[PDB]
Amino acid sequence: VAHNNVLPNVHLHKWWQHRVRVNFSKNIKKKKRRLLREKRRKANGGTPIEKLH
Amino acid sequence: CIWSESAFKKLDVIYGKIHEKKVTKKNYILPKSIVHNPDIYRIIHSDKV
Amino acid sequence: PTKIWRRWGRKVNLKEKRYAVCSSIAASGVTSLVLARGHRISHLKEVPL
Amino acid sequence: SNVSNALVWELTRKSNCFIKKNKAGKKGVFLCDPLNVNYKNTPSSSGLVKSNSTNVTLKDGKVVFSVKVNQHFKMKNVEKLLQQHGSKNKEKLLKKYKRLSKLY
Amino acid sequence: ATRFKKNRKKRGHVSAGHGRVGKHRKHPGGRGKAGGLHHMRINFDKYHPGYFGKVGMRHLNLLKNRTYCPTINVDKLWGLLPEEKKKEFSENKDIAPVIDVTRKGYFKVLGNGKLKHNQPIVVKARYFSSVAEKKIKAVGGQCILVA
Amino acid sequence: KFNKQKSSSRRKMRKAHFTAPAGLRRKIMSSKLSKELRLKYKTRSLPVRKDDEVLICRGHNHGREGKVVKINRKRYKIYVERVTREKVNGESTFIGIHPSNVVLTKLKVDKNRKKILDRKA
Amino acid sequence: AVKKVGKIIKKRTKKFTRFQSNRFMRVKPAWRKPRGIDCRVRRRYKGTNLMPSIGYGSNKKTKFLLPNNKYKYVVKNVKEMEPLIMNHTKYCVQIAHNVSSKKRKQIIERAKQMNVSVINAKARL
Amino acid sequence: PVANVYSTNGKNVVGEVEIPVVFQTPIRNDLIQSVYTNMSKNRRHPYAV
Amino acid sequence: GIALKNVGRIKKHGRKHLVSKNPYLRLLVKLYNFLARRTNANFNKIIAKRLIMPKRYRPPLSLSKLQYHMANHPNDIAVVVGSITDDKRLFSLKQLKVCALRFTETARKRIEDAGGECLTFDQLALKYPTGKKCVLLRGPTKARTAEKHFGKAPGKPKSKARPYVRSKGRKFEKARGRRKSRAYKK
RNA sequence: UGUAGGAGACCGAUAGCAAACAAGUACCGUGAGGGAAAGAUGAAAUAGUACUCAGGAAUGAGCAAUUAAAUAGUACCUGAAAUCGUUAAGAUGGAACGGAUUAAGAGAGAAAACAAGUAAAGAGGGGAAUAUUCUCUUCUUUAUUAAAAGAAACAUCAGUGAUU
RNA sequence: UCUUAACCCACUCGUCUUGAAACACGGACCAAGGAGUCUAGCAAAUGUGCAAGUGUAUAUGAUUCUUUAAACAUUUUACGCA
RNA sequence: GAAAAAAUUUUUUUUUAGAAUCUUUUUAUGAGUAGAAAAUCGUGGGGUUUGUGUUGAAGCGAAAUACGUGAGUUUUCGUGGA
C-alpha cells in the first residue's frame, strides 16, 4: 500500500482461477425458458399453467 | 430514412403524442437543445448586438 | 494468455440509448447531413422521405 | 429550431464523403460536393451553407449547371442561366465555365 | 484501449518510466497491506488513523432489518405533497393535509428545516424527533403515532 | 441463407465437395439442357451419362459438339470424342472437361434416365 | 550546402542516415534515436553522424513544395481532375503506383486538358 | 411545419403531415459515436487461448 | 548567454479551449468568445471562461439559492454558468428571470408555472449583449465529496478531512489516533 | 470428457492443439516416462520432359520439345537477408568505416529547369439550328513571330561591417 | 545520384556504475519470433446522460429470429449507492 | 474589392484569401539522464465512407532532379502473377 490509496478487500489469494464462471448463455437461456413454458402451455390445450398464491 | 405514413404517425405517438398507454415509452421525455437557435451569425447581425 | 475473463461487453444506459435513437432520427431528418453521409439525394422530393 | 448551416459545419468539417485531403504533402484539403463552388474545404465553398446554391459541375460526359429544390441544366445557354436564377461569385462561375467547357 | 496506453508513449525506453536505476521489481516492501504498523506505519497513521486495535463489545448476529430506519426531515415533509394540492391547502384555511409518511416509505421524522407559519398539517409516523414534534405543535399541526 | 441447420462456412462446403458420395458426385456432374429440351422435360440441368452428346461452351475447345467417351467422377472431368490431345510422348488421350463447361444436346435414354425424367417432369 | 531555387530555400539536402549503420550490419539506415548512455549522439560529441533537428524544417511559404513550383497531388482516378482544374496553377499531378495503362493514358490525356503536366508522365509506356 | 407525403408512384403526392417533435431534438454526434462504439463492444464475440 | 528566470517564458495554466466534441457547446463558446473579445465589459469574458471550465467547475446552482439572491434584485435577469436544480425543501416560487446552462425539467416547469422566464445563453446574448442590468451567478465549488476528503492528513493535529474509509463497518477506523483511549488522538 | 451441429472483430505453418502430414508416430530412456522435424508445380500432367548428339555411366548440350510461362521439370509457387561465384570499375606504406566541405570520374534525368500565339494538313472529339446543315474545340504533323525565366555582371539604394 | 580522393575533425556499442575507449560485463553473422498485460475492486482526472435521485438487478414481454449471441419493451413503496 | 502584362478605347493573357487546435502579424525563447506530457508515423483486425484489380495489383531487388526536421511517405525500372 502507498499514498492516498484505501486498504484493499479482495479475496483472490485462494486459487480462484478454477472457481470462476462467466455468463455468456444469458439471453439464449432466457429464450430457452420462454420456449419451454410456451411449449408446455400449448401442450396443455393452451389452458393456464399458472399457480394462484 | 424512408417512412410509411403509418410509421411516421406511430413515431409521433411513441415519444409522447395521444398518451397511448402501451404504445408510449413509460413516462419518457424528449431532450431539448442547450442552444435555442443555432444561427449565431444572425445574433451577430442583429441591431442590439 | 488470453482468457474469457476479458471485459468484452458494457452497460449502455437506458436514457442514453433513447437519446441516441431520437437524436439519430433527428439527424436523419437533416437534408444536408444525408448528402454528407454520401446518400445520392439529388432527385429526392422531400427532406425526410 | 435545433439546426443551422453553422452547426452543420461544426458537425461536418472533418466528416463528409466529399472531403478529400492529400497525404502526399499535407497542404491541400478539398470538398467535392455537387453544389460546392470552389473545391477547397471551407463552409463558404460548401454546398451545405448557401440557401439556393449555384454550381457548374461536369457529370456523365456533360457539363451541368446545378441550382438548389435541386434543378439542373446544360456558352449563351450558360450565360443566360447565370443571369437568371443567380445571386466575386459571377466572375468565378464564368472562369469555371471557361475551363470546364473545353473538356472531353 | 491498447492504442492510447503509457507503454505506447514509452515503447522503446528500457525500464520505460519505472526507473533505470531502480530496475523495477514487484512488491518490494512485502505483500498487500502487510507492512502496516511495521514499515508503512507512517502511511497508515497519516491516511487511515483509527485502523489498529480492538474497540467495543460484540453483537453476534446483527440482523439489520430489526433496527431499520428510513427517515425524513420536516423540511422535505411538505415536498411529499404535490404543488397544486399544496396551493389548495394554502388557499383553504379551514382544512389541513394528512400525510402518511410510512405509506410513502418513512418511519422517523426529524427536525431539520422550516414549516410555513400558520399552516396546520397532520403527520403520521412511527417515530418523531423532539424538535419535529415541537415544530408540528408550533404550526398547529397534529402528530399521529401509527404502526 | 435462413436455415441454421447447414453451415455457411467455406470450410464445410469444401470438405463436402472433396469427400462426396456417388449421388453427390452425380449431382455435381450435371449439365444444362438444350432450350427446347428444357421446355420438353421441364428441367434446367441433368446428370451426365455415358452415351450423351454435349456441346462445349467455354475454354479453347468451345463451340465443338460431340459424344461423351468416358466420364471421370474422381477428377470431375468428362471426355468427349473430338477433344483429343497428344501428350509429351505423342500418345493421344482425350482432354478432360469439367461439366460446367458443356451444354447437353442429346441425352442418352435408358430405364434409370426415364425414371429421372418422370421424377423431374 | 544550402539549396536555393528562386524563393524556395531548402536547408539540407543530405538525409540524416542512422548512427554507424555500416559498423553493425543488422542496423538499417533510417533514423532511430539512441536511448543509450554515452552514445556519442545525444552526448553531443562533434564528428559523428548528425542528429536530425526541427531547425532544419522548411519555410512556411514553401513547406512541401517541389522545384516544379507546384504542390504534388497523387492521382488514382479520373474523377480527381475536378478539384485539380481549379488548383492547376498551384498543384501538379502525380499518377499512382497501381494505375492500369488504359486508365493511366486516359488520365494523362485529361491532365493535358487541365493544362497540368504529370511529373511521372513517361511511366507504363 | 408540414412535410409532403408521396404515393408509391412518386408522380403523385398525397396528404401533407406535420413533422414529429422527435426531429426537433438536439444532434449529439459525439454521444451517437460513443454509444455506437459501446454497443459494438456488446456485439463482439469473446476470445481465449 | 542571457540569464533567464523560467527561461523567459510565461507558462500560465488552465483550459486552452473546450475539450468536448459537443457541437452546440462548441458553437456557444465561439459566440461568447466573439462577444468577449469585441465588447468592452468584463462580464462576457468571465462568462466565456466559465463556459469553457471542467465538469466539477460546472456545479449545479440551487433554485432556492438563486431565489434567495434575486429578492434584492427584484426585476433583474440572473445568468448562471451551470445547471439549475429544483428543491423539494422549497414550498413555492416568487417568480424569477433565469438564464442557465441546463434546466432540470421539473424546475423549468416550476419556473413556467410561477410565470418566470427560462433563458438559453443564445437568447440572453441576443437580448442583453452588453450584460447591463444583468446578474452573474454561480453554484458552490467546495460542496463536492472529493473536496470533503481534501486537506490535512487524517489523524494529524487539527485535521478534519474525511478519510477514504475501507468500509462502513462499526469496528473500523475509530481506534488508534482517533480516540485517546487507544494509542493517542488527533 | 465422447459424439453431433452452428460460430467468430481468433491463428495463418517458428502461429494455432504436441500434431493442417502415414503424429501421440518416428526417435530417445532399464523403466515409470520423455517426445519431434514434417503442407503448397500448373488451368490442365487423360499436358510430368518425347527426340537427337557427345558421354563407361552419371549427366551435359541441342537445328530437337510440352506449356501462356520451364533461371515453372516433382529437393517444382513467390524465392528476402546472411553467404559464396563470374565480369567490369575503383582502391591498396601497421587497420576499418564515419562527420563536415569541395573534387574528379562514372551514371541518370527535362516534371520550373525557354519559346505563348499565327498560318498551312493529318488524327480526333463536342455544342447549336430545323438524321444533318451550321458552329465550337484538343492532340500529331511543316515554319513563323512573340515573350517570360533563372544564372552571371556592373551600377543604383537601404541595413550592416572593415578600411584611411 | 553513386565513387573514390584530399584538408580538418572522428576511440567498441549496449550496460550496470559517481565514473567505461578500457586490463569492467554481454555481443561471430544474418533472418524470423521476442518482454507493463488482463481480471477484480478503488481513486482522481476529463467527457457524457440525468438529478434528490440514480442504475434497471435477476427476470419477464414481444407481429424479435441468416446476420438477432442484439436490438427493443417492462400494466406507480424491490435492491445498491447517494 | 480590381492589380499587372500582352494585343489593336476595345479585344487577349495571368490572378481575385474568410476552414478558431483557423489566417495574418510581432517579440521573446530553444541544454538535458532518470522522469512527465503532447503532437505524430507504422502494423493486425472491425464498422463506415469511395476506390484499386490480371491493358498484372500486392510482394520482392535495384533505384527516384521526389516529398517530409523525422519516423516515414510517394513514385520509377526489373522481377512477380493475385
Resolution in Å, one decimal, please.
Answer: 4.7
Identify the CA nearest to G8 among candidates G69, G91, G89. Answer: G69
Max distance between CA atoms of chain G, in angstroms, equals: 60
Report the C-alpha gap between A34 and A25 in whole angstroms. Answer: 14
Contact G104, G95 (CB under 8 A): yes
Q: At what angle do helices I42-52 and I23-38 cross, to 10 degrees?
A: 160
> Among residues D96, D97, D59, which one has the least CA distance to residue D78?
D97
Distances in Å between the Cα of I33 and the Cα atoms of B49, F96, I27, I30, I127 are 14, 80, 10, 5, 17
- Mention every residue, 6+ apart, whose C-beta is less than 8 A from residue E80: E72, E99, E101, E104
Say yes or no for a CB contact (<8 Å) between E33 and A1.
yes
- What are φ and ψ of residue I126, in 5° steps? -60, -50
Side-chain half-sphere of F49: how many Cα atoms within 13 Å? 15
Between D76-85 and D89-102, two packed helices, what is the crossing angle to 10 degrees? Answer: 150
- DSSP string covering I62-121, please? EHHHHHHHHTTSTT-EEEEEEEEE--TT-------EEEEEEE-HHHHHHHHHTT-EEE-H
Which secondary structure element, helix H or strand E, spans residue E124, and what is its range? strand E122-125
Q: Please check whether residue I66 is in contact with residue I78, taking contact to mean a CB–CB distance below 8 angstroms.
A: yes
DSSP state of D52: T
Report the C-alpha gap between E99 and E78 in whole angstroms: 9
Interface of H with I in 6-45 (CB under 8 A): 26-30
Is F13 in a helix, a strand, or coil? Answer: helix
Q: What's CA G32's distance to the chain center, in Å?
A: 20
Only one residue has cell 475473463, namely C5
d(CA G26, CA G21): 8
- For residue G121, give the amino acid letter: A
DSSP secondary-structure letter at I185? B
Instruction: Evaluate if the CB of G50 falls below 7 Å from strand J.
Output: yes
**DSSP 8-state class, residue E82:** -
Taking every pair of Cα atoms in chain A, the longest distance, rounded to a whole number of angstroms, is 69
Instruction: Give the three cell numbers for residue D67.
Output: 441550382
What is the 8-class DSSP label of residue E116?
P
- G57: DSSP letter: -
I68-77, long-range: CB < 8 A, 24+ apart: I69/I135, I69/I137, I70/I96, I70/I97, I70/I135, I73/I135, I76/I133, I76/I134, I76/I135, I77/I117, I77/I119, I77/I124, I77/I128, I77/I133, I77/I134, I77/I135
Residues A32, G4: Cα–Cα separation, whole Å: 78
F53-56/F102-104 β-pairing: antiparallel
Interface residue D79 vs chain I (CB under 8 A): no
Q: Which residue of E has its CA nearest to G32?
A: E12
Give CA–CA dist I149/I165, Å, rounded. 10
**What angle, 0 to 180 degrees and rounded to 10, lies between the N-to-C axes of helices C14-29 and H29-43?**
120
Rounded CA separation G107/G95 (Å) = 8
- Cα–Cα distance measured from residue E84 to residue E92, given in angstroms and rounded to the nearest whole number: 12
Instruction: Answer whether D4 sits within 8 Å of B38, measured CB to CB.
Output: yes
Nucleotides on chain L that have an atom closer than 7 A to a protein CB are 1-2, 14-21, 24, 28-40, 42-43, 49-58, 65-77
Our CA-based measurement puts residue B13 at a distance from the nearest CA of chain H, in whole angstroms, of 9
CB H31 within 8 A of CB C23: yes
Cα(D91)–Cα(D84) distance, integer angstroms: 15
In the structure, how far is the CA atom of residue G23 from the C1' atom of nucleotide J84, in angstroms?
Answer: 21
C-alpha cell at I121: 445563453
Cα(B15)–Cα(H26) distance, rounded to whole angstroms? Answer: 15
Q: Which of E72, E73, E70, E71 is nearest to E114 (CA)?
A: E73
**Furthest-apart CA atoms within chain I: distance in Å:** 71
By the 10 Å C-beta count (0-12 exposed, 13-18 middle, 19+ buried), H25 is classed as buried
Contact C30 D3 (CB under 8 A): yes
Residues 11-40 of H with CB under 7 A from strand J: 40
Please name the nucleotide lying closest to G12, CA to C1'.
L69
d(CA F37, CA F117) in angstroms, rounded, equals 11
Torsion of CA D43, D49, D55, D59, to 10 degrees: 80
Q: Quick check: D4 and B37 CB within 8 A?
A: yes
DSSP code of residue H40: H
Taking contacts as CB-CB distances below 8 angstroms, the residues of chain D near H25 are: 2
Pairing of strands D71-73, I60-62: unpaired
Residues of chain I whose C-beta is under 8 A from some C-beta in D? 23-24, 26-27
CA of D56 and C1' of L68: distance in angstroms?
36
Q: State the structure-solving technique.
A: cryo-EM
Grid cell in block for residue E56: 467495543
Distances (CA, A) of F74 to D81, F12, F16, F31, F67: 72, 19, 14, 17, 20
Can you read off the three cell numbers belonging to residue F103? 451444354
Is the CB of residue G81 inside 7 Å of nucleic acid strand J?
Answer: no
Which residues have CB under 8 Å from H18's CB, separation 6+? H1, H2, H3
Which of the residues I166, I171, I173, I176 would you substitute to probe the A interface, choosing the one with the greatest number of A C-beta atoms within 10 Å? Answer: I166
DSSP classification of residue I52: H
Question: Which 8-state DSSP code applies to residue E110?
Answer: E
Chains adjacent to H (≥3 CB pairs closer than 8 angstroms): B, C, D, I
Closest to D92 in 3D by CA, of F41, F28, I86, G86: G86
How far is the CA of D83 from the CAs of D46, G86, H49, in angstroms?
Answer: 22, 22, 71
**CA dihedral of residues I103, I104, I106, I108 (deg, nearest 10):** 0
Determine the Cα–Cα distance for residues D81 and D97; give it in Å rounded to an integer. 12
Question: Is some CB atom of chain C closer than 8 A to the CB atom of A15?
Answer: no
Residue H1 near residue H10 (C-beta atoms within 8 A)? no
Q: Estimate the crossing angle of helix I63-70 against helix I105-113, to 10 degrees.
A: 40
CA-closest candidate to residue C29, choices B3, D34, D71, D32: B3
Please, which residues bridge with residue D66 across strands? D55, D72
Asked whether the beta carbons of E80 and E99 are under 8 A apart, the reply is yes
Helix (H, G, I), strand (E, B) or coil at B25: coil
Query: How far is Cα B16 from Cα E41, in angstroms, rounded to an integer?
Result: 61
Tell me the DSSP string of G18-70.
-TTTTTSTT--SS------TT-SSSS--TTSPPPP-GGG---TTTTT--TTSS
- Using a CB–CB cut-off of 8 Å, the residues of H that contact B are 5, 14-15, 17, 20-22, 25-26
How far in angstroms lies nucleotide L73's C1' from the CA of residue D25?
Answer: 9
- C-alpha–C-alpha distance, residues G69 and D50, integer Å: 34
Q: Which residue has the cell 445563453?
A: I121
User: In the block, which residue shows the cell 432556492?
Assistant: I64
- Angstrom distance, I72 CA to J26 C1': 99
Exposed/middle/buried for residue I7 (C-beta within 10 Å: 0-12, 13-18, 19+)? exposed
Beta strands of chain H (E only): which ranges?
2-3, 17-18
Instruction: Give H-chain residues touching D7 at CB under 8 angstroms.
Output: 27
Q: How far is G38 from chain E (nearest CA, A)?
A: 15
Q: Which phi and psi angles does I102 have, rounded to 5°?
A: -150, 140
Residues D39, G76: Cα–Cα separation, whole Å: 18
C-beta of residue E109 within 8 angstroms of C-beta of residue E73: yes
Contact flag I163-E54 (C-beta cutoff 8 Å) = no
Shortest distance, CA C14 to any CA of chain A (angstroms): 18
Distance CA G66, CA D25 (A): 10
**Measured between CA atoms, how close is E13 to chain G, in angstroms?**
7
Residue I17 DSSP class: S
Give every CB contact of residue D75 below 8 A, 6+ residues apart in sequence: D97, D101
Contact indicator for I108, B32 with CB cutoff of 8 Å: no
Q: How many CB atoms lie within 10 A of CB G14?
A: 7
Label residue E133 exposed, middle or buried (CB < 10 Å: 0-12, 13-18, 19+).
middle
Q: Closest residue of D to B39, CA-based?
A: D4
Kindly provide the residue ranges of all beta strands, DSSP E only, lying in F2-120, ordered along the sequence: 30-33, 45-47, 53-56, 65-72, 77-86, 92-97, 102-104
Strand partners, F110: none
Place of cell 430506519: E69
C-alpha cell at E104: 410513502
Classify each residue of I93-103 as buried b or exposed e, where b means 16 or more C-beta atoms within 10 Å of its C-beta.
beebbbbbbbb
Comparing C-alpha atoms, which of I106, B14, I21 is closest to residue H21?
A: B14
Pick from I51, I49, I96, I90: nearest CA to I72: I96
**What are the C-alpha distances in Å from I38 to residues B42, I31, I33, I43, I126?**
16, 11, 9, 12, 15
Strands I77-85 and I60-62, sheet pairing: parallel
At least 3 CB pairs under 8 A between chains B and E: no
SS3 I157: coil
Residue with cell 521489481: E25
Give the integer Cα–Cα distance in Å for H31 and G11.
47
Q: What pairs with residue I83 in β-bridges?
A: I60, I102
User: What SS3 state is found at D93?
Assistant: helix
Query: 3-class SS at F46?
Result: strand
B-to-H residue pairs, Cβ atoms closer than 8 angstroms: 28
Q: Chain I closest CA to A3's CA: distance in Å? A: 11
For K73, nearest residue by CA–C1' is: B25
Q: Are G110 and G78 in contact (CB under 8 A)?
A: yes
**Strand order through the sheet with E98-100:** E98-100, E122-125, E142-145
Distance CA I7, CA G19 (A): 32
Q: Residue I72, Cα to own-chain centre: how many angstroms?
A: 21
Helical ranges in chain D per DSSP H = 5-12, 76-85, 89-102
